[PDB]
Protein backbone atom coordinates (compact mmCIF):
# COMPACT_ATOMS: atom_id res chain seq x y z
CA UNK A 1 0.00 0.00 0.00
CA UNK A 2 1.55 3.33 -1.06
CA UNK A 3 0.16 5.15 1.96
CA UNK A 4 2.15 8.29 1.17
CA UNK A 5 -0.41 10.98 0.25
CA UNK A 6 -2.25 13.09 2.77
CA UNK A 7 -5.52 14.93 2.40
CA UNK A 8 -6.12 17.36 5.34
CA UNK A 9 -9.27 15.38 6.42
CA UNK A 10 -10.94 18.14 8.49
CA UNK A 11 -9.10 21.50 8.46
CA UNK A 12 -9.83 24.40 10.92
CA UNK A 13 -12.11 26.43 8.54
CA UNK A 14 -12.98 26.70 4.79
CA UNK A 15 -10.05 27.35 2.39
CA UNK A 16 -9.64 30.51 0.25
CA UNK A 17 -8.85 29.97 -3.46
CA UNK A 18 -5.29 29.06 -4.47
CA UNK A 19 -4.16 28.86 -0.84
CA UNK A 20 -1.93 26.18 0.68
CA UNK A 21 -1.39 25.14 4.29
CA UNK A 22 1.14 22.72 5.74
CA UNK A 23 0.31 23.41 9.40
CA UNK A 24 -0.35 20.08 11.13
CA UNK A 25 -1.66 21.57 14.38
CA UNK A 26 -4.28 19.45 16.11
CA UNK A 27 -7.84 20.37 15.14
CA UNK A 28 -10.46 20.65 17.89
CA UNK A 29 -14.17 20.25 17.16
CA UNK A 30 -15.48 20.26 20.74
CA UNK A 31 -13.77 22.10 23.59
CA UNK A 32 -10.79 24.47 23.32
CA UNK A 33 -8.45 23.24 26.17
CA UNK A 34 -6.37 20.91 23.98
CA UNK A 35 -3.31 22.86 22.81
CA UNK A 36 -1.11 20.82 20.48
CA UNK A 37 -2.36 17.51 21.89
CA UNK A 38 -4.69 15.02 20.23
CA UNK A 39 -7.26 14.66 23.00
CA UNK A 40 -10.79 13.35 23.29
CA UNK A 41 -12.31 15.74 20.72
CA UNK A 42 -9.03 16.93 19.16
CA UNK A 43 -7.94 14.93 16.10
CA UNK A 44 -4.57 14.92 14.26
CA UNK A 45 -4.45 17.21 11.12
CA UNK A 46 -4.35 15.32 7.74
CA UNK A 47 -5.14 11.72 6.59
CA UNK A 48 -3.06 9.13 4.70
CA UNK A 49 -4.38 7.94 1.37
CA UNK A 50 -4.84 4.29 0.45
Amino acid at each position, epitope marked *: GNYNYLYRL*FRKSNLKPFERDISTEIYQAGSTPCNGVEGFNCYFPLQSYG
Partner: antibody
Amino acid sequence: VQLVESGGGLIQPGGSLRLSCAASGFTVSNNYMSWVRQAPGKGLEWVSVIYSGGSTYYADSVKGRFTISRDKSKNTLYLQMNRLRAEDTAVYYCAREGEVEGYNDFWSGYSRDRYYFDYWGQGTLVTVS
Amino acid sequence: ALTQPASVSGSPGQSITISCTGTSSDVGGYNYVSWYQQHPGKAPKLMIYDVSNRPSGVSNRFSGSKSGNTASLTISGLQAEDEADYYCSSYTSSSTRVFGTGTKVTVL
Protein backbone atom coordinates in the same frame (compact mmCIF):
# COMPACT_ATOMS: atom_id res chain seq x y z
CA VAL B 1 -7.79 -5.60 6.57
CA GLN B 2 -5.09 -7.80 8.10
CA LEU B 3 -2.97 -7.59 11.25
CA VAL B 4 -0.10 -10.04 11.81
CA GLU B 5 2.02 -10.06 14.97
CA SER B 6 5.45 -11.46 15.83
CA GLY B 7 8.25 -11.10 18.36
CA GLY B 8 6.90 -12.76 21.51
CA GLY B 9 8.42 -15.72 23.28
CA LEU B 10 10.29 -16.82 26.38
CA ILE B 11 12.18 -14.07 28.22
CA GLN B 12 13.64 -13.44 31.67
CA PRO B 13 12.46 -10.68 34.03
CA GLY B 14 14.19 -7.33 33.69
CA GLY B 15 15.23 -7.90 30.07
CA SER B 16 13.84 -6.30 26.92
CA LEU B 17 11.34 -7.33 24.26
CA ARG B 18 10.07 -5.51 21.17
CA LEU B 19 6.79 -6.60 19.59
CA SER B 20 5.71 -6.19 15.98
CA CYS B 21 2.32 -5.74 14.30
CA ALA B 22 2.40 -5.43 10.51
CA ALA B 23 -0.87 -4.03 9.18
CA SER B 24 -2.01 -4.54 5.59
CA GLY B 25 -5.05 -2.86 4.09
CA PHE B 26 -4.62 0.21 6.33
CA THR B 27 -1.91 2.21 8.09
CA VAL B 28 -0.56 2.88 11.56
CA SER B 29 -1.45 6.52 10.83
CA ASN B 30 -4.90 6.26 9.28
CA ASN B 31 -6.73 5.16 12.44
CA TYR B 32 -5.77 4.89 16.09
CA MET B 33 -3.71 1.81 16.97
CA SER B 34 -3.87 0.22 20.42
CA TRP B 35 -2.22 -2.69 22.22
CA VAL B 36 -4.30 -4.95 24.47
CA ARG B 37 -3.15 -8.02 26.40
CA GLN B 38 -4.98 -10.98 27.93
CA ALA B 39 -3.45 -12.94 30.79
CA PRO B 40 -3.72 -16.74 30.37
CA GLY B 41 -7.37 -17.61 31.00
CA LYS B 42 -8.14 -14.11 32.24
CA GLY B 43 -9.75 -10.82 31.24
CA LEU B 44 -8.65 -8.17 28.75
CA GLU B 45 -6.34 -5.36 29.86
CA TRP B 46 -5.74 -2.39 27.58
CA VAL B 47 -1.98 -1.89 27.39
CA SER B 48 -1.46 1.28 25.37
CA VAL B 49 -2.72 3.31 22.41
CA ILE B 50 -1.04 5.55 19.85
CA TYR B 51 -3.20 8.06 18.00
CA SER B 52 -2.87 8.88 14.30
CA GLY B 53 0.09 11.06 15.26
CA GLY B 54 1.85 12.50 18.29
CA SER B 55 0.44 10.31 21.09
CA THR B 56 2.33 8.02 23.46
CA TYR B 57 -0.42 7.00 25.90
CA TYR B 58 0.08 4.00 28.18
CA ALA B 59 -1.49 2.31 31.19
CA ASP B 60 -0.35 2.92 34.76
CA SER B 61 0.82 -0.71 34.97
CA VAL B 62 3.24 -0.22 32.04
CA LYS B 63 4.19 3.47 32.19
CA GLY B 64 7.93 4.08 32.01
CA ARG B 65 8.55 0.47 30.94
CA PHE B 66 6.70 0.07 27.63
CA THR B 67 6.93 2.49 24.70
CA ILE B 68 4.71 2.25 21.62
CA SER B 69 6.07 3.15 18.19
CA ARG B 70 5.52 2.61 14.48
CA ASP B 71 7.33 2.67 11.14
CA LYS B 72 5.32 4.44 8.44
CA SER B 73 7.62 3.06 5.73
CA LYS B 74 7.12 -0.60 6.71
CA ASN B 75 3.55 0.05 7.98
CA THR B 76 4.29 -1.86 11.19
CA LEU B 77 3.24 -1.20 14.78
CA TYR B 78 5.86 -1.72 17.49
CA LEU B 79 5.75 -2.11 21.27
CA GLN B 80 8.99 -1.98 23.24
CA MET B 81 8.81 -3.85 26.55
CA ASN B 82 11.66 -2.99 28.92
CA ARG B 83 12.11 -4.22 32.49
CA LEU B 84 9.58 -7.01 32.10
CA ARG B 85 7.99 -8.54 35.19
CA ALA B 86 6.28 -11.81 36.02
CA GLU B 87 2.82 -10.22 35.94
CA ASP B 88 3.30 -9.26 32.26
CA THR B 89 2.79 -12.88 31.16
CA ALA B 90 -0.03 -12.62 28.61
CA VAL B 91 -0.90 -12.80 24.93
CA TYR B 92 -0.67 -9.36 23.36
CA TYR B 93 -3.05 -8.10 20.67
CA CYS B 94 -2.68 -5.04 18.45
CA ALA B 95 -6.12 -3.52 17.91
CA ARG B 96 -6.97 -0.98 15.22
CA GLU B 97 -9.51 1.61 16.35
CA GLY B 98 -12.59 2.62 14.35
CA GLU B 99 -11.97 4.17 10.95
CA VAL B 100 -13.58 7.58 10.47
CA GLU B 101 -17.23 7.15 9.46
CA GLY B 102 -17.51 3.50 10.50
CA TYR B 103 -20.37 1.76 8.65
CA ASN B 104 -21.39 5.37 7.80
CA ASP B 105 -24.54 5.91 9.95
CA PHE B 106 -25.68 8.73 7.65
CA TRP B 107 -26.20 11.27 10.42
CA SER B 108 -22.78 12.27 11.79
CA GLY B 109 -19.85 13.27 9.62
CA TYR B 110 -16.13 12.63 9.87
CA SER B 111 -15.67 13.42 13.57
CA ARG B 112 -12.87 10.92 14.15
CA ASP B 113 -13.89 9.86 17.68
CA ARG B 114 -15.72 6.54 16.88
CA TYR B 115 -14.00 5.04 19.92
CA TYR B 116 -14.23 1.25 19.61
CA PHE B 117 -12.12 -1.65 18.37
CA ASP B 118 -12.07 -2.90 14.78
CA TYR B 119 -10.50 -6.22 13.67
CA TRP B 120 -7.65 -7.44 15.87
CA GLY B 121 -4.35 -9.21 15.37
CA GLN B 122 -3.73 -12.90 15.94
CA GLY B 123 -1.85 -12.43 19.22
CA THR B 124 1.58 -13.60 20.35
CA LEU B 125 2.57 -15.33 23.58
CA VAL B 126 4.75 -13.39 26.04
CA THR B 127 6.05 -15.50 28.93
CA VAL B 128 8.32 -13.66 31.38
CA SER B 129 10.33 -16.13 33.47
CA ALA C 1 -12.25 -0.16 36.23
CA LEU C 2 -15.35 -1.97 34.95
CA THR C 3 -17.09 -4.69 36.96
CA GLN C 4 -19.00 -7.51 35.27
CA PRO C 5 -20.76 -10.67 36.46
CA ALA C 6 -18.27 -13.52 36.25
CA SER C 7 -20.82 -15.71 34.44
CA VAL C 8 -24.43 -15.81 33.24
CA SER C 9 -26.58 -18.67 31.99
CA GLY C 10 -29.79 -19.26 30.09
CA SER C 11 -31.73 -21.58 27.82
CA PRO C 12 -32.09 -21.21 24.04
CA GLY C 13 -34.97 -19.06 22.86
CA GLN C 14 -35.24 -16.48 25.63
CA SER C 15 -33.22 -13.33 26.39
CA ILE C 16 -30.39 -12.50 28.80
CA THR C 17 -29.19 -9.15 30.12
CA ILE C 18 -25.57 -8.42 31.04
CA SER C 19 -24.61 -5.58 33.38
CA CYS C 20 -21.45 -3.49 33.65
CA THR C 21 -21.23 -0.84 36.38
CA GLY C 22 -18.55 1.85 36.29
CA THR C 23 -17.92 5.46 37.28
CA SER C 24 -19.53 8.63 35.93
CA SER C 25 -16.35 9.55 34.04
CA ASP C 26 -16.43 7.14 31.08
CA VAL C 27 -19.75 5.27 31.03
CA GLY C 28 -21.84 7.87 32.85
CA GLY C 29 -20.12 10.83 31.23
CA TYR C 30 -19.24 9.65 27.73
CA ASN C 31 -21.21 7.65 25.16
CA TYR C 32 -18.70 5.31 23.47
CA VAL C 33 -19.45 2.10 25.45
CA SER C 34 -18.68 -0.99 23.33
CA TRP C 35 -19.14 -4.75 23.62
CA TYR C 36 -17.10 -7.68 22.29
CA GLN C 37 -17.33 -11.46 21.93
CA GLN C 38 -14.28 -13.72 22.24
CA HIS C 39 -14.42 -17.48 21.66
CA PRO C 40 -11.70 -19.59 23.31
CA GLY C 41 -8.65 -19.44 21.07
CA LYS C 42 -10.07 -16.68 18.83
CA ALA C 43 -9.54 -12.92 18.87
CA PRO C 44 -12.47 -10.85 20.18
CA LYS C 45 -15.14 -9.52 17.83
CA LEU C 46 -16.90 -6.16 17.92
CA MET C 47 -20.47 -6.81 19.06
CA ILE C 48 -21.81 -3.40 20.10
CA TYR C 49 -20.40 0.13 19.64
CA ASP C 50 -21.73 3.71 19.98
CA VAL C 51 -24.04 2.27 22.71
CA SER C 52 -27.47 1.87 20.95
CA ASN C 53 -25.82 0.96 17.57
CA ARG C 54 -24.69 -2.47 16.25
CA PRO C 55 -22.09 -3.19 13.52
CA SER C 56 -23.53 -4.54 10.28
CA GLY C 57 -22.90 -8.20 9.52
CA VAL C 58 -23.95 -9.19 13.05
CA SER C 59 -27.10 -11.00 14.19
CA ASN C 60 -29.78 -8.42 14.96
CA ARG C 61 -30.67 -10.15 18.24
CA PHE C 62 -27.73 -8.41 19.92
CA SER C 63 -28.70 -5.14 21.59
CA GLY C 64 -27.09 -2.77 24.06
CA SER C 65 -27.96 0.17 26.28
CA LYS C 66 -26.65 2.13 29.24
CA SER C 67 -28.60 3.67 32.13
CA GLY C 68 -26.33 6.17 33.84
CA ASN C 69 -23.16 4.57 35.20
CA THR C 70 -24.35 1.06 34.23
CA ALA C 71 -24.04 -0.52 30.78
CA SER C 72 -26.26 -3.32 29.48
CA LEU C 73 -25.89 -5.97 26.78
CA THR C 74 -29.33 -7.49 26.15
CA ILE C 75 -28.81 -10.60 24.03
CA SER C 76 -32.02 -12.14 22.71
CA GLY C 77 -32.77 -15.59 21.35
CA LEU C 78 -29.69 -17.46 22.57
CA GLN C 79 -28.32 -20.10 20.20
CA ALA C 80 -25.55 -22.66 20.67
CA GLU C 81 -22.87 -20.47 19.06
CA ASP C 82 -23.36 -17.66 21.60
CA GLU C 83 -21.19 -19.54 24.13
CA ALA C 84 -18.28 -17.14 24.73
CA ASP C 85 -17.12 -14.41 27.08
CA TYR C 86 -18.28 -10.82 26.59
CA TYR C 87 -16.23 -7.75 27.52
CA CYS C 88 -17.70 -4.27 27.94
CA SER C 89 -15.24 -1.59 26.79
CA SER C 90 -16.43 1.91 27.59
CA TYR C 91 -14.76 5.12 26.53
CA THR C 92 -11.41 5.89 28.10
CA SER C 93 -11.79 9.27 29.89
CA SER C 94 -8.56 10.87 28.59
CA SER C 95 -6.88 7.93 26.84
CA THR C 96 -6.55 5.34 29.64
CA ARG C 97 -8.90 2.72 28.22
CA VAL C 98 -10.73 0.17 30.37
CA PHE C 99 -12.39 -3.22 29.99
CA GLY C 100 -14.83 -5.27 32.02
CA THR C 101 -13.98 -8.40 33.98
CA GLY C 102 -15.80 -10.59 31.45
CA THR C 103 -19.09 -12.52 31.40
CA LYS C 104 -18.81 -16.14 30.27
CA VAL C 105 -22.27 -17.09 29.00
CA THR C 106 -23.38 -20.73 29.18
CA VAL C 107 -26.27 -21.89 26.99
CA LEU C 108 -28.42 -24.78 28.22
